[PDB]
Amino acid sequence: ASLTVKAYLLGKEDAAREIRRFSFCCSPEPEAEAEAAAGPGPCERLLSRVAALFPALRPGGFQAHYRDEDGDLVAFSSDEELTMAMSYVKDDIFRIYIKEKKEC
Amino acid sequence: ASLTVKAYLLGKEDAAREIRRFSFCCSPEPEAEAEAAAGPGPCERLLSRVAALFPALRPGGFQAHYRDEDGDLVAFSSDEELTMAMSYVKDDIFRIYIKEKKEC
Amino acid sequence: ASLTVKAYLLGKEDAAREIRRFSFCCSPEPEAEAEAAAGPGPCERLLSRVAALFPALRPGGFQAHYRDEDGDLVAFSSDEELTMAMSYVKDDIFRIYIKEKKEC
Amino acid sequence: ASLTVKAYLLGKEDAAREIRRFSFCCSPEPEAEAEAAAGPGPCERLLSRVAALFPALRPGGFQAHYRDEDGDLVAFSSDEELTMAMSYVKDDIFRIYIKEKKEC
Amino acid sequence: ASLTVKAYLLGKEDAAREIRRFSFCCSPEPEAEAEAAAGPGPCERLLSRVAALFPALRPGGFQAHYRDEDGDLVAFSSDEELTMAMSYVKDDIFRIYIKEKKEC
Amino acid sequence: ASLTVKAYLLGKEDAAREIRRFSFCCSPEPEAEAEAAAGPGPCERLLSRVAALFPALRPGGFQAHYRDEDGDLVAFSSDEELTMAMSYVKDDIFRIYIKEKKEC
Amino acid sequence: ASLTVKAYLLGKEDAAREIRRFSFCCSPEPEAEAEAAAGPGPCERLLSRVAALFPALRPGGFQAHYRDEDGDLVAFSSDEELTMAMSYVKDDIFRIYIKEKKEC
Amino acid sequence: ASLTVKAYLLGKEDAAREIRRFSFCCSPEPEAEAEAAAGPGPCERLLSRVAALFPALRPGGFQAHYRDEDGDLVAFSSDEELTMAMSYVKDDIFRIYIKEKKEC
Amino acid sequence: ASLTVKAYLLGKEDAAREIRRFSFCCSPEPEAEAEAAAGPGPCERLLSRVAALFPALRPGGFQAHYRDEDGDLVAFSSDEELTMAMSYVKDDIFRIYIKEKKEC
């Protein structure tokens, strides 16, 4: 399941500041034997890869979102919630919206 | 009865600060034998799951609401009152509105 | 006679601070034999249930009101006066307005 | 019954000088057999724990209060009066107000 | 007849120095047979309980008051006068005002 | 459990004078055998590390705080109270507020 | 690891008075044999080079800072804390903010 | 038990003339075998050390005090009374107040 | 351990009359063999150097102080007390306050 993720980085008034467009492999998985318990999570691997590409942000300091049917930026941080996020993929493009974690 | 809960977290002037959109299983129930008296309540399981997802709040320190026909944010904390809250579900989306418990 | 009571809790300048919306069973009554003299009163059961739901108030320390045709918050504390309060029900919603009993 | 006590230490013009926020276990009780007559009292265990946390005060030399509906700092020193103090708990936070015992 | 007594202890310029807020059982009475002539009086039981709570005063050395409609601190020491004092109870709170017996 | 502590040093009117931002390892612990009774405490190791970084203060002469839901600077000095302090961590940043111990 | 350091020298109201922009070689290191124990530290070499360039300050009399995600000038003086400072480098520019050590 | 003693030497109108701030080891004690009956007393070792530091006074000719909760300079000369003096230590600072023994 | 001593000479109303700012070498020590018993003391070498610089005072006729956390001028004359004085060094500046020994 080759899945393209188009990571929007949002700015001041929720206008996009930098777009990245990488590829992601959620349903694919490594070798079918346990070298660990079971890897990282599918949302933990996503946020580890969004943090690796953008130079403008550091890992652990950003909140990834998506747009639902109402147009609202629904956040996601879990991997049982990333599966609800990915039911909104249009063609193969999973558009996420990155916002940084400021003061309050 | 698969039931989607869209948890709005309200901010200063009752504008939404973070939206979460999880799924909830009120009328479904576990195995039909008593390992306890009868679990937690259906409102106790809801507020335990809203507190688990949001990192910005801690359990026991938030008031969950809903909108009635007048547009007012009617609060609910009981499980005989959650059944009146859930008679306002539109398609399968049960929109609740979270407010934190401040000074006075 | 299923009767919905929408309990407004009034604040500083008579603006609503918390709304509760429960159901009430005035004209319904229990088993048709005397285990007591005759229960509590229909206004005593109402104020015992408004005090049970709101965590922000304690029983015996609040005054329940209603709006008459002039727009004034007419208070009620009796059960021969609750019957005059309930002649203002609109559809099945009996809107009461709770005010706490402060210093003077 | 997990119960949070937020101990305000009052200063010169009844402004708070140090706040402590511990937890208290009034209605919980130890093993259901008598190793003594019946422990200390529930108010004696409270004032023994407020004195243990604050370094600025010594046991036997402080008066614990609470706010009633009038806004007045009602004192309490008994354990049949601590039960009237604890009917003012809001969520689970039992706010007491500590004042030291000076000259006159 | 559960009756709450809020005992104000007055200070120098009739400003309250310590407030106590206990409960009192005037119209309730013990077992309906004579183990004595008839107990203490209802004012004798009140002043015995106000003296038991306050550590700052000793029994027989304080004058309990109440406020009438004129705002004056009307004293009471009898139990045929305590019945006139208790016709000024507002909700269930019988506010008395304690003054100590000094030189002259 | 890698945990970032952002130590605010408060000044005259509780405005921050110097911020330090170190890392802390509360739930991690050394080798699983007793070279001592059990180390220092988790609050004793925290205050030993806050004192090591700031040159402007000396150990034993500062009071570490945190902000609760009311916005109040709740102090903590125990290690059964540091566990209640650390239930307010937002992302992984545990903001403490340092105040020095002056005259009175 | 060629790393550019842009040293802001702050003035009265934290406005920059002189900017210097040198280069720094933290992760690079000299010959792989011990002519000493291990050189100076990576923060000791940084503050020795900031003091060498600015004529307006003398070594040992300035506090180097950085901006975190909250916009606060977090100070650093250690070399286990300089490694947390350098996780905020944007492209290759490590912006530090110099403040002098005055009276109090 | 490392215990800091801040010895105020009082002057004419009980204003401090010279402050000394030494350290004291009351609860610590020497080798656990009797080379004597049991040393000097813990108050005898304190007054022998206050006399050793101040050049302005000679041993046997000064009265050491402390402040109680009333603000009064309570004197102490015994070692069963020094244990009541040391229940007023604030952080680890045991403030004593020295007065010399004049005519009458 | 290069240590800067800023010697304030106090005047009439404890206002500084002359400031000197020399350097001091407490923890450094001479050749590691005994040409004497062990030199002078570290406080004896300090007061011998403060007396050498100021022309306005003569040795043996001045009392050196320091400020503690309370703002009080704590005196020191011993070398087991100079080690408690030097735990208040801020950057490397050990501010002492010189007062001359007048009549009484």
Author numbering:
A (entry chain A), B (entry chain A), C (entry chain A), D (entry chain A), E (entry chain A), F (entry chain A), ...: 2 to 105
What text appears in the publication on this structure?
PB1 domains are protein interaction modules with critical roles in the assembly of protein complexes involved in autophagy, signaling, cell division, and redox processes, as well as the auxin-response pathway in plants. Our cryo-EM structures of filamentous p62 and AtNBR1–PB1 assemblies revealed that the presence of a tandem arginine sequence in the basic motif of type AB interfaces is required to stabilize a polymeric assembly.
Of the three PB1 assemblies studied, AtNBR11–94 (AtNBR1–PB1) and p621–122 (p62-PB1) formed homogeneous filaments of constant diameter that appeared best suited for high-resolution structure investigation by cryo-EM. Image classification of segmented PB1 helices revealed that both AtNBR1–PB1 and p62-PB1 polymerize in two different tubular morphologies: a projection class with a ladder-like pattern, we term L-type, and a projection class with a serpent-like one, we term S-type. For p62-PB1, we observed a four-stranded L-type assembly and a three-stranded S-type assembly. The L-type here has a pitch of 135.9 Å with 14.16 subunits/turn, and S-type has a pitch of 138.6 Å with 13.60 subunits/turn. All four structures form tubules of ~120 Å and 150-Å width with an inner diameter of 45 Å and 70 Å for AtNBR1–PB1 and p62-PB1, respectively. The overall fold of the asymmetric unit was found compatible with the NMR structure of the p62-PB1 monomer. The β1–α1 loop in p62 is flexible and only visible in the L-type assembly density. The main interactions are formed between a double arginine finger formed by two neighboring arginine residues in strand β2 (R19–R20AtNBR1/R21–22p62) stabilizing strong salt bridges to acidic residues (D60/D62/D64/D73AtNBR1 or D69/D71/D73/E82p62) in the OPCA motif located in the β2–β3 loop and the α2 helix. In addition to the canonical transverse interactions, the helices are further stabilized by longitudinal interactions Y14AtNBR1/N28AtNBR1 or K102p62/D92p62 and R59p62/D93p62 to subunits of neighboring strands along the helical axis.
